[PDB]
Design a protein that fits this description.
The chain is α+β, with helices and mostly antiparallel strands. It has helices spanning about 10-25, 35-45, 55-65, 70-85, 90-110, 130-135, 140-155, 160-170, 175-185, 190, 200-205, 240-245, 260-265; strands spanning about 1-5, 210-215, 225-230, 235. Helix 5 (about 90-110) packs across helix 7 and helix 5 crosses helix 8. It is classed as hydrolase.
Length: about 270
């Protein structure tokens, strides 16, 4: 197994290496015109201003020129992290349900100016009621969130029931909910928080790939497989010797930025040549 960089989005680093092999080997050629891969191409061009023309020919050229495994991670893992967010269909409902639990269990607490630590964050089964909200930054995000909910709650005109809260927030907190989705899906803590294979499933389905974690393979699945080894928080990607020799590490390492500097995207990668 090839170890992926732990820095940044470690699962995305591993997937980027495995995906690059499948792409450069030609084994995904039948898929490159499908909507998933056109979306990948769009995200690659959005992240890399020197990428031109916008085509899978150019994308393969970039993977062939930046073929050192660390360079692949640096040029492709941010792109896959951005693409993954296009497939987070569930996230709007999830954040609405978190915000609903927060307000339903704490309406008076919030109105009365209590601090985040004083809020009920656990339900009647011991379940976490809003874990993604509570992972936001305490001073930059969670304090302003409580101030914003104090404003919003001045218009609450109903009996306090969970259903009434949920409908109220759907109508009256649309812009707040959109902003919370952006933070939860793309802020630096979200990039670094550690993902499971299932949290990429919408993307990998659209890319016609199955992520195989620790030999846990569905033999009824005839899609291209990216094989991974999950090491508590470390990740290896499996690559046979023939594919390794032909499609990885054929070029010297060229890029010097960190994973988080690569994700930020301010430093341009030079076009090949």
């Amino acid at each position: 197994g090839i170890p992926a960089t732990g820095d940044g989005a470690c699962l995305f680093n591993a997937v980027s290496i495995g995906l690059s092999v499948e792409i450069l080997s030609g084994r995904l050629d039948s898929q490159l015109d499908t909507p998933g891969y056109q979306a990948l191409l769009d995200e690659f061009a959005k992240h890399h201003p020197q990428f031109n023309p916008k085509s899978w020919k150019t994308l393969k050229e970039w993977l062939a020129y930046y073929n050192d495994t660390r360079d692949i991670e640096l040029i492709l893992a941010p792109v896959l992290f951005n693409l993954n967010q296009k497939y987070q269909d569930h996230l709007d409902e999830e954040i609405l349900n978190e915000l609903t639990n927060l307000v339903w269990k704490n309406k008076a607490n919030i109105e009365n100016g209590q601090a985040w630590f004083q809020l009920q964050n656990t339900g009647d089964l011991g379940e976490a009621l809003f874990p993604k909200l509570e992972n936001l930054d305490l001073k930059k995000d969670r304090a302003p969130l409580l101030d914003k909910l104090r404003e919003i709650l001045k218009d609450y005109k109903l009996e306090l029931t969970r259903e009434n809260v949920k409908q109220f927030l759907t109508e009256k907190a649309k812009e707040l909910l959109s902003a919370l989705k952006k933070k939860i899906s793309s802020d630096p803590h979200a990039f670094q928080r550690g993902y499971s294979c299932d949290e990429l499933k919408g993307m990998t389905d659209a890319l016609a790939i199955s992520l195989v974690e620790n030999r846990e393979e569905d033999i009824t699945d005839n899609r291209i497989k990216i094989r991974l080894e999950n090491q508590e928080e470390h990740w290896n990607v499996l690559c046979n010797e023939e594919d390794s020799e032909r499609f990885l590490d054929s070029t010297p390492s060229r890029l010097k930025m960190t994973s988080l500097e690569a994700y930020r995207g301010d430093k341009q990668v030079s076009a090949p040549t």
